[PDB]
Amino acid sequence: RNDRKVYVGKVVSDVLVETYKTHKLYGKRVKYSKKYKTHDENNSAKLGDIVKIQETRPLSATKRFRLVEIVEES
Amino acid sequence: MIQQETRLKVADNSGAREVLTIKVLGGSGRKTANIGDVIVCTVKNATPGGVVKKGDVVKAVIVRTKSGVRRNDGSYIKFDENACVIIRDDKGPRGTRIFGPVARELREGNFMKIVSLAPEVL
Amino acid sequence: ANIKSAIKRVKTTEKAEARNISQKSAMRTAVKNAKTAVSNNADNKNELVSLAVKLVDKAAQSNLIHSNKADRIKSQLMTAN
Amino acid sequence: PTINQLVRKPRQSKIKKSDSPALNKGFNSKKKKFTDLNSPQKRGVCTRVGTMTPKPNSALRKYARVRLSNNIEINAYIPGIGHNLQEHSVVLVRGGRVKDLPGVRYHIVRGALDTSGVDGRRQGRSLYGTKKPK
Amino acid sequence: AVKIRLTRLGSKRNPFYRIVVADARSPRDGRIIEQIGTYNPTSANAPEIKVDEALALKWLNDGAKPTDTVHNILSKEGIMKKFDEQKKA
RNA sequence: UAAGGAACUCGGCAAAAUGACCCCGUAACUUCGGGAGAAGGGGUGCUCUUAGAGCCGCAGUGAA
RNA sequence: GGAGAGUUUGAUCCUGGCUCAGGAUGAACGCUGGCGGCGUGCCUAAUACAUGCAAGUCGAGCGAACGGUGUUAGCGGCGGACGGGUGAGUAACACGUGGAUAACCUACCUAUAAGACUGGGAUAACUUCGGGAAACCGGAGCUAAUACCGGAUAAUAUUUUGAACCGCAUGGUUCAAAAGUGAAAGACGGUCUUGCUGUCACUUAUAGAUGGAUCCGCGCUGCAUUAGCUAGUUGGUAAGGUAACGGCUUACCAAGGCAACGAUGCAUAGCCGACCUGAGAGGGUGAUCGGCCACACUGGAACUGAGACACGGUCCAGACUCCUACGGGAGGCAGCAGUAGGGAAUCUUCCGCAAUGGGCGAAAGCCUGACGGAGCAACGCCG
RNA sequence: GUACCUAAUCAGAAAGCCACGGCUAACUACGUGCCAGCAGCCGCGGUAAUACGUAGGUGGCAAGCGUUAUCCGGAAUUAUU
Ligand SMILES: [K+]
Ligand SMILES: [K+]
Ligand SMILES: [Mg+2]
Ligand SMILES: [Mg+2]
Ligand SMILES: [Mg+2]
Ligand SMILES: [Mg+2]
Ligand SMILES: [Mg+2]
Ligand SMILES: [Mg+2]
Ligand SMILES: [Mg+2]
Ligand SMILES: [Mg+2]
Ligand SMILES: [Mg+2]
Ligand SMILES: [Mg+2]
Ligand SMILES: [Mg+2]
Ligand SMILES: [Mg+2]
Ligand SMILES: [Mg+2]
Ligand SMILES: [Mg+2]
Ligand SMILES: [Mg+2]
Ligand SMILES: [Mg+2]
Ligand SMILES: [Mg+2]
Ligand SMILES: [Mg+2]
Ligand SMILES: [Mg+2]
Ligand SMILES: [Mg+2]
Ligand SMILES: [Mg+2]
Ligand SMILES: [Mg+2]
Ligand SMILES: [Mg+2]
Ligand SMILES: [Mg+2]
Ligand SMILES: [Mg+2]
Ligand SMILES: [Mg+2]
Ligand SMILES: [Mg+2]
Ligand SMILES: [Mg+2]
Ligand SMILES: [Mg+2]
Ligand SMILES: [Mg+2]
Ligand SMILES: [Mg+2]
Ligand SMILES: [Mg+2]
Q1: Do C and E have ≥3 inter-chain CB pairs under 8 A?
Q2: What's the domain count of chain A?
Q3: Which UniProt keyword terms apply here (chain C)?
Q4: Could you tell me which residues come within 8 angstroms of residue B45 by beta carbon, excluding any fewer than 6 positions away?
């Protein structure tokens, strides 16, 4: 078929997906994070859990991801 | 029925918005003026960029009044407001447009340019 | 306005708009009538639904509505039938 | 500084400034606003011609006061020996400050608009607006 | 519709043409779908036709239509004959 | 009380205007309490349903 | 593939700024000026625009009229959403790059298959009677079609019964198997048998191709002497709505959402391939050519249509300009030329559809200021 | 009737611009006398000026040559290198 983007992150409100942005001029890696509002269905996950998410069609004004699996419990 | 201190809307685009009547011209002791009469006035309110500015002392012809006028056939015409047009000595308008209806008595007054530019002459 | 074919297009647009308005109005009336008849289980609720389905399909053929909108309207009646 | 300091606060180069600021501005009359255009010359009108004394040097250096087409007032030097300028003259003004004359940052172009060429010039005439003799 | 047509290259009085597959609405020298050859009508001896025969038949079988000049070019390279023969067979 | 609206007069004296309740909204300055009811704006009747739908007048804190 | 020099002192070595030698330009100005080729030429006022031209075509869809087989106005089809201009707005999924759609639409074109049955009623033209300066508007009749509208047949499309198999959650691909429901047109020819049949045209279904839409990762200017922003806001449920997912909209419920990894506000800016410079790392620019976006006097809408919320369409509001016989009417060069204005400064109110490309047409062909050429300017490069 | 080609005639129509103290290639005379003027910088001119103006000569370019404006370089003068 085709593959949808997958991320792993920590719940910050019941997902933060911290990544690195290498500096264009100096070459140093700098940590940056982006919050991915995701769809949890039956409110299963809680704050601090490390979760896996997958990209979906728009679900609301800002939700574009579905929580597929919980990796590390809060 | 316009007298000293009567404030009038200006029905042209010359820059003046409201004027205050300084004098009714046309003889000693004249107290009131009506449609077609000429007044000396001062511009109390002006719009930006107009030729006529606030504080200027100008001459204007009355073009509509609340008192209105009576015609020889026993008919009358009355308006909802008092409005005038700033003029030069040649009785031509200082502005280039006329707003709202004006009375046909202006034609007898020989304000033909104002009559021509008016959108309605009643 | 200025161009000869633009001037003609004003007339043909007005003719099409008049026909389209009539057919849209009739189609919407039948859909509303069929919707009401379901919410009360009338004896002829089947005839009113069949009429509404007939007119919605004719509007889609006339490009008055999209086929996707006709399908969406058709289902709403038929599930409730 | 450290690499981390540079990442937090990158380098910033000094901003260069123009030696002829009156040439790099326009004026929109309709909107009554100033533009930025970088013209090589500007037209202007002479408000006051005259002379001025230099700062070691000693002379009577001829100049004019000019209102440029962008409504900016400048002092412009008149090069060459003799000129035909006076009040209300229409002049073309170019860049180039004259040392020893404080407050004069521009030059009048000889041989353009109303300014005449230098009379009797025979060497470097194109700098002084003089046609070729004979 | 989709066309097989000539886009102009070269310089003044010295035209060179690329043979391209393009949307009819695309500007003559603008966006194309795929180039399939060249055409040089001012060459010294031969008009120097350089058509990719496998590409031309794929687009012809996909509904692309040549302009009048491109039809003559494809005919001179036998592409039109192979197109007609493959359609019946 | 027409039209005008402080032209009256030493001076807007007197009069006119404002005014209740409910909800919005509120400046300089400040001793940080204020200024403040700043200013400036919206809603009020009656009937019916349970915020909507209606009804009537020039006008609904229809008077004080 | 990498050059320095002058200048602070009585003299010195440092530090440090300043200036100069190089390259470049949509240049301008001064003096000067022979030619040819190739290119380039309003950067300012998205200022206002006189005049001409920049979108038509089809009589082999149709009736009529006028002319002697032709043509005109009209109905009808297709085009006018392309091509051309401009960079005002926009700091945003606008653009670049990489992906996703199991949330999408797609005229004309191509292929395949099944069809194309049977009726009806309008109306422009036109004739006649009027009304208006005009723009134009009314009354009476008349009439055709590949115009319009009924009915029949057609299901893969919809509902329900389920089933098998599969995926990335919503789900998806088939298998059915019953119920409703949806079309169409002729023109010009051949043979003639008035039956069959050619081309083009018409309908439905399914693919392909083309074009368009939405979403997401990363990349995108200053100012913190801009620190709080948001209340459809953030999520949920339901309904409505859309091609489509979705606060897209509404109702009710909850109090979320964004931000020092710079939210928000202000200012500036169309973005990219590219272009200039530089040894490079970088710095600077977006005129010309190509891709994408946005806009069409300003603002708001919708209609037709496959596609527009439409540069040379409509409706409304506004500013401005023009005609008027004062009742009323008309217009939009940021198309090509050209004018006025502003400016230091930027061209002809040219020729042709011969070529390439586009629209319409069966074709001949018609239209095409796209385009191909010519004109003006040492503006640049080369000779 | 353009490009191009062929024949005839004539050196006859067809050279200017800036600079010359140092940076920086290229100097003398006359005039002027801190004036007039020059100037990117250093600075030049107040009676023997290679710097002002002209002339001769020379240098650099050449259908161009200079000036101004703007950007990068020189600038390691924001320095990751
Ligand atoms: K010294
Ligand atoms: K053509
Ligand atoms: Mg040939
Ligand atoms: Mg009274
Ligand atoms: Mg009264
Ligand atoms: Mg009053
Ligand atoms: Mg008084
Ligand atoms: Mg008194
Ligand atoms: Mg009192
Ligand atoms: Mg009270
Ligand atoms: Mg040329
Ligand atoms: Mg422009
Ligand atoms: Mg304009
Ligand atoms: Mg016709
Ligand atoms: Mg079709
Ligand atoms: Mg039809
Ligand atoms: Mg802008
Ligand atoms: Mg370097
Ligand atoms: Mg439509
Ligand atoms: Mg259009
Ligand atoms: Mg236009
Ligand atoms: Mg034009
Ligand atoms: Mg000018
Ligand atoms: Mg053609
Ligand atoms: Mg034409
Ligand atoms: Mg020149
Ligand atoms: Mg030397
Ligand atoms: Mg000199
Ligand atoms: Mg001497
Ligand atoms: Mg010197
Ligand atoms: Mg000298
Ligand atoms: Mg040369
Ligand atoms: Mg520099
Ligand atoms: Mg530098």
Answers
A1: no
A2: 1
A3: Ribonucleoprotein, Ribosomal protein, RNA-binding, rRNA-binding
A4: B16, B17, B18, B54
